[PDB]
Amino acid sequence: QGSILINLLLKQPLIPGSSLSLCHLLSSSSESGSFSLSALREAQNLAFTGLNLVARNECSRDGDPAEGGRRAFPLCQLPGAVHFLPLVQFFIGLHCQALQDLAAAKPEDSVCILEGFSVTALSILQHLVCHSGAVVSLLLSGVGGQHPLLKMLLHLLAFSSAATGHLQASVLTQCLKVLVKLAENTSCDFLPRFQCVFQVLPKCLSPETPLPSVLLAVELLSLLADHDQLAPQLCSHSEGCLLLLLYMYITSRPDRVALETQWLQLEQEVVWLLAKLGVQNCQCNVEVVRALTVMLHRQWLTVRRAGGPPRTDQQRRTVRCLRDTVLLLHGLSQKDKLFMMHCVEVLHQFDQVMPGVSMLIRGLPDVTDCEEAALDDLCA
Amino acid sequence: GSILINLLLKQPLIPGSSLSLCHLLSSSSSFSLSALREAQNLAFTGLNLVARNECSRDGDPAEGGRRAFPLCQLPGAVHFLPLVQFFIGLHCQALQDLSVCILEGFSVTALSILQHLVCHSGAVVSLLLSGQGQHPLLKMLLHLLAFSSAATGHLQASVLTQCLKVLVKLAENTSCDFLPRFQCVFQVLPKCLSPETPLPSVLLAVELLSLLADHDQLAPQLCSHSEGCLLLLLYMYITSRPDRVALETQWLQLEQEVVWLLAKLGVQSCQCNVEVVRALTVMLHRQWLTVRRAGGPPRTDQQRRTVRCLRDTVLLLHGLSQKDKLFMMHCVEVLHQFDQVMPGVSMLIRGLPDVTDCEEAALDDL
Amino acid sequence: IFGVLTKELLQLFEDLVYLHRRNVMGHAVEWPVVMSRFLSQLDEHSAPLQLMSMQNLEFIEVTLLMVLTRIIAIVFFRRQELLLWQIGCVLLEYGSPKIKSLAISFLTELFQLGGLPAQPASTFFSSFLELLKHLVEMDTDQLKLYEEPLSKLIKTLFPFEAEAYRNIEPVYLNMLLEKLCVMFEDGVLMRLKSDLLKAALCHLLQYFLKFVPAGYESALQVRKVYVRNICKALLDVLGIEVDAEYLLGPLYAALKMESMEIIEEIQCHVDMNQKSILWSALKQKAESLQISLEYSGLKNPVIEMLEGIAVVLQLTALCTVHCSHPSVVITWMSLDFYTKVLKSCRSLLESVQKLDLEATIDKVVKIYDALIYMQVNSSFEDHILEDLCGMLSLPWIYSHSDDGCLKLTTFAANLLTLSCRISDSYSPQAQSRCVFLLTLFPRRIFLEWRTAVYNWALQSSHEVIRASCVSGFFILLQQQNSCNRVPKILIDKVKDDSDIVKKEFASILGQLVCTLHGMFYLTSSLTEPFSEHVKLAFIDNLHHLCKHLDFREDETDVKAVLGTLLNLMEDPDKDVRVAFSGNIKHILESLDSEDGFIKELFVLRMKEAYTHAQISRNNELKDTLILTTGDIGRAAKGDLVPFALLHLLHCLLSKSASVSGAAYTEIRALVAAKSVKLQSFFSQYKKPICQFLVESLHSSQMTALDVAHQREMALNTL
Ligand SMILES: [Zn+2]
């Protein structure tokens, strides 16, 4: 009896600034071939039918815990959500061909209005898919194999892959959040469906691309990693490693006027992904050792400066990131012995980082041997 | 009610016009581009409260006493009412001024939403209970209804109906002391009955007139004037039908509402007192004709309702026979037309198994 | 392999938690339950856990959750927390007092470990709010079992810090402020035996008030609705509880917020009370406390009623100072109404039993601190301050009675007779706080008594009175005869068994240069309203003390002091050397130049540091000293920076990699401070840097005094 999705969808406009949010979608007027205007109106009417339909059904999201575990979330199948989705289909489909035309030239205003509205629709879609697993599975099923709105959203992803203007960069970060929600919702068999997103992803994580997009992209890559076939699909085997670009972004961060918090969380997400990867010749393997040395150094420096418990969530964050990074590194040493050779480049700073890290580690109560032993491997 | 949230978020209740309840919450276009955006945010807050639907649980068991079986008292409903004020009341100002159509559509949509809220919430009524000038939205509604009858516009026709229905539904559940407020509606209601006022508004009128006879202050009002009495405008509309459409299944409804009103006035215990009796005779005939030609009982529920109005008319003319004992003096003039209808319906009423022994003695009189 | 093992463990724990949830449905029972996972050939070359009573399950699940937490570091992955959080939401669904607490902690931990996904938070949030509501029905033994963990989980979910409102879903924040105001209308808060629970409710209320973006949690009007419900509950609970302190805060915060809104309302003179209707109800509560005090006389428990009145008055005074009003002005509680409360307080002090008034004196001391905050916002002219200073010394007056100060003080006569009864009940620490306020008492009122009382508290051997006196003694001395020279009695008194008295004297020195300046108006808070709930102190004090001091160049005086200060800067305590690190940069700012006498002192310090470093052979001291030498170099734009950089190069040119790394970090720091390209800052000091490197190369030649290793070393230096 949650209806969290319904409250999210119909409420104050989710988008800061522009007030275009599902609510308006439903009330959106016609003035403001295949994508007929009447079909637009009908997509609105469909999301409204779903509004009036969701509450009606009664359901248990997960029949058993294992099944709900696989998805990582229980969803009660609300027919309303599936009806909602056609509205997103129309608004996302809009302005895609218009963007294509804008680019082919060498008409924009329509593309812009439609794109703002479409980011609204993307957030709305996140919510709607999040609540009902049926609306998701519908998009998810394929011949070999994507939903039609899924193909239009792939177009949108191509726009993400493409060089991102300011507004397009924010839109792209939105798309990446959509994608992480997409993944988590997707079923294991639907991960092969997600395989197509990989080709878009390398452009998605780029020095030009904004930070929040990269945080969400690391999350999406992590979601993809669980699939056995997807996991190898990461580095290009000497062809530029794809992971290689993410860790490079973290090592040196384009878009330097950005929230430090989100930087930190992106890095922590890559840490989590590295762990999950561990559970499941390259230039990149040498390259990865550099970003992590830099990050552990940042954290250690922060600790040295700081005194007493971490009031700031940021400081507690480092304490935790430092321990996790030390753990990943201990492996960045047990994993490869050649690892240390390519690490020597940053080893000057890393060696200094290490000892005070050992100190703080031994200090923290959350710290453990499995955590301090990791550190002992790096510094000796 | 959870359904109240459904109603809230529903395709345009009003048939057509492209009305979006999502615009009743978020519409760019009293004015000045401030605090109306805030009203929209408030509608969103009500939607948030609405969704959870925690209130509409176990059939509103908390509320008790008067207004028994109260539509689950809803806090969110009270919140929706303010934006409705930005809507309905604005046109009321346009009305105060000597375009308007665009405003009228939004106003009609707002009135429909207001009707739903009033019907299904125990809060917007608590607002009526607050009291004057309190419940200022009612003052705006009353202004609109009085003006709606006065001016005959394509927008005027419906708005009258809607305001009347709101008033009526609310007055239903309210207490007697709370009906002393609705008293103000009695004065404005007189214009509504006249044919010039919308027929759909005249039917809601008949309904509210029955309700008036239910109220102690409204009764005297129904027969207070030396001339007219402020009643019998209703008696005259059933007898003479001012509608080009003149669908048969509307005049029966008017007369049947009026007959329920008369039976209710009886149970509850001028020249206007006299018109109800002759009009009841006329209706007894009218309902009689539809059934007589086809013969046998009703192949229509509305036809069964016409038969019910028939039996009620014979019984009510009997009460009217006992009433003003000197029934014959005022009856004679319409007495031929009434005598034509009475005894055949006597036979028909004897035919049906359902007819009561008390209705049967009534029948016996005539 | 490790991960496959952990995954089997996860699946087993999930089977057990699912067995619990199926017990909840009651459809089937697996007892005895043996998990499919972890069956091994070793058992029969098995014996999976077997449980037969629901509590056996509960224990198995507790153990398994402990294991999950312990591995959490390695186990947590991106979206691994999703499944764990579903499991934890189930664990919360039905919660045994202790497993419930540990699961609270666990979901909080995961929340921190990977943030909080929007969707999973709804699942757990539902059960969570349900638990909150059940609190009042719950017996203390059961609810408290997990409450503390509840409080920590709330802290994490509703951290006062930035973006904690982002973590929570806005609807969830509205629901929680709505759930809180409900408990408040219920009085459940006061009902629950544990104060920290209602305290966590107030925590959330404040978090909404100040930190959260206005309206993000809920609509502003309905948020004010919840605030008013909270005020309603608080007004009653305060009169009920013997001590309202655990509620004073939330109240004070609401008061300040209401004043903020009022000010904006006024402008596109109204009392901050009459302006806010909810604050008007708070004023009604305060007036009721005062009336009950006066009307009851002996009937009302002096301690409780006095505590309530003191809480009210403290709120009023806090607002007085913090809230600032000739178009607009803000009225405040009348000091004559204060005098009425004070007549009541004297009558109570007389009425309380000797042992009974110790609590009353404590509450009275708190009320006096509030009155002192009022005096700081606006120093009462003469007589209120007089009577106050008198009362604060009453515990000492009955003993002082036979003193020369008593003979001189104007109010001392009546104070002698009045002090005997109230003092034996006067708590020593209470009278200590009184002297803290008595020291605050200005000179104009009870001048003789105030001077003699500072002198006495210095004379008194007890530490509390002496510390109170020490606090305001610098100001006293300033006002007494001389802002420049401290008094000898205090000088002897400066030395204290408590390090904190010494740190207070550090702050006092830092304040003494201002003391030479016209004594600034003093307010206990002085800024920064207190929340409701020492060589390093020496560096802190000095940073502020030097700026006012004329020490940029001064003289031998500086030379000598700075000598002692350099000894200290190199202090055995690693933390001492640290956090004085950069205190030396603040000193470079404090110094008018980095050359000459200052440069000579720096060179002497570097020599001493080289000797100590050879002796120390301790990495921590070296880290501190490296950072300090660095900060020094960075702060300077002249010769010292290249001199420090050459010392740092010598440090870098050492077999130990750590020395070179530390010096390199300092080099990067200086380059940054310099704000020039690597090659450019090289260019500025290229001649001296390379000359020092060539002297190091000549020392390396003396060391040589094989070419192979020599050349390898030279290339590595390059
Ligand atoms: Zn690679």
UniProtKB/Swiss-Prot annotation, chain B:
Q: Which domain of life is it from?
A: Eukaryota
Question: Where, subcellularly, is it found?
Answer: Nucleus
Please report the PTM annotation for this entry.
Phosphorylated by ATR.
- Tissues/organs with expression: Ubiquitous.
Disulfide bridge positions per record: none
Annotated motif EEXXXDL motif, positions: 359-366
According to the record's subunit comment, the protein's assembly and interactions are:
Interacts with ATR. Heterodimer with ATR. The heterodimer binds the RPA complex and is then recruited to single-stranded DNA. Interacts with CEP164 (via N-terminus). Interacts with CINP.
Q: What is known of its domains?
A: The EEXXXDDL motif is required for the interaction with catalytic subunit PRKDC and its recruitment to sites of DNA damage.
Q: What does this protein do?
A: Required for checkpoint signaling after DNA damage. Required for ATR expression, possibly by stabilizing the protein.
The similarity annotation says: Belongs to the ATRIP family.
Descriptive protein name? ATR-interacting protein
Residue numbers of the full-length protein present here: 309 to 776 of 791
UniProtKB/Swiss-Prot annotation, chain C:
Q: Which gene encodes it?
A: ATR
Tissue and organ distribution: Ubiquitous, with highest expression in testis.
* Protein name per the record: Serine/threonine-protein kinase ATR
**Disorder cited:** Seckel syndrome 1: A rare autosomal recessive disorder characterized by proportionate dwarfism of prenatal onset associated with low birth weight, growth retardation, severe microcephaly with a bird-headed like appearance, and intellectual disability.
**Subcellular location, record wording:** Nucleus; Chromosome; Nucleus envelope
Q: Which domain of life is it from?
A: Eukaryota
Q: How does the annotation summarize its subunit structure?
A: Forms a heterodimer with ATRIP, forming the ATR-ATRIP complex. Present in a complex containing ATRIP and RPA-coated single-stranded DNA. Binds to DNA, and to UV-damaged DNA with higher affinity. Interacts with MSH2 and HDAC2. Present in a complex containing CHD4 and HDAC2. Interacts with EEF1E1, the interaction is enhanced by UV irradiation. Interacts with CLSPN and CEP164. Interacts with TELO2 and TTI1. Interacts with BCR-ABL after genotoxic stress. Interacts with UHRF2; this interaction promotes ATR activation.
Please state which protein family the record places this protein in.
Belongs to the PI3/PI4-kinase family. ATM subfamily.
Changes after translation: Phosphorylated.
This chain's function reads: Serine/threonine protein kinase which activates checkpoint signaling upon genotoxic stresses such as ionizing radiation (IR), ultraviolet light (UV), or DNA replication stalling, thereby acting as a DNA damage sensor. Recognizes the substrate consensus sequence [ST]-Q. Phosphorylates BRCA1, CHEK1, MCM2, RAD17, RBBP8, RPA2, SMC1 and p53/TP53, which collectively inhibit DNA replication and mitosis and promote DNA repair, recombination and apoptosis. Phosphorylates 'Ser-139' of histone variant H2AX at sites of DNA damage, thereby regulating DNA damage response mechanism.
Q: Where are the HEAT repeats?
A: 555-591
